[PDB]
């Protein structure tokens, strides 16, 4: 029996984007995803009370532009056989730095490390660990780029292999890519 984990963040509504794309929103039927792991930058509780609608288990991490400060700056969870680490990623300098992200992986002692902020999607394995960045679901802009392709990641967890699906909205048609990771 599969576990499906939704991974998304850097929404940045209302300031940077009005709402998540309807096309994305149509795919996230409530109940069909069991877990939700969010990198942060919602930022308003509008979205936090929205994410709750879609699944019973939802975890936020604190973003540098998140207004509810009680979110944890990082969270470690387990789903099936996978120990997952979650962090927004503004703590990593330079942004998305590999060596730094690796420490947080070993420090957190996780199989999969999720981080955001760079608004750039990543899903890859490094030294037998798997690193995910869902990118920005709204396509929100970062300090350096204005045409950022919206995207969110859905993890399919089956025993010791996670299948990671990324859906990025290029043009106005959802498109996806598969990346498979097995615990070593």
């Amino acid at each position: 029996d599969r576990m499906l984990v939704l991974v998304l963040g850097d929404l940045h509504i209302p300031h940077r984007c009005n709402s998540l794309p309807a096309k994305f929103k149509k795919l996230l039927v409530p109940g069909k995803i069991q877990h939700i792991l969010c990198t942060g930058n919602l930022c308003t509780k509008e979205s936090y009370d929205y994410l709750k609608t879609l699944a019973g288990d939802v975890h936020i991490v604190r973003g540098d532009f998140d207004e509810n400060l009680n979110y944890p700056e990082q969270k470690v969870v387990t789903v099936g056989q996978f120990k997952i680490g979650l962090i927004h990623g503004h703590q990593v300098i330079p942004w998305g730095d590999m060596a730094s992200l690796a420490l947080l992986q070993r420090q957190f002692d996780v199989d999969i490390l999720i981080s955001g902020h760079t608004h750039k999607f990543e899903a890859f394995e490094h030294e037998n660990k798997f690193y995910i960045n869902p990118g920005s679901a709204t396509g929100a802009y970062n300090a350096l780029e204005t045409n950022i392709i919206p995207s969110f990641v859905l993890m399919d967890i089956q025993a010791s292999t996670v299948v990671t699906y990324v859906y990025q909205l290029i043009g106005d048609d959802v498109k996806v890519e598969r990346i498979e990771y097995k615990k070593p």
Binding site: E73, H90, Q91, V92, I93, D97, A99, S100, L103
Partner: peptide, 14 residues
């Protein structure tokens, strides 16, 4: 580097 609530420290030398 790693930005923490208690400082910002290099991960290694450099």
């Amino acid at each position: 580097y790693i930005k923490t609530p208690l400082g910002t420290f290099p991960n290694r030398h450099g």
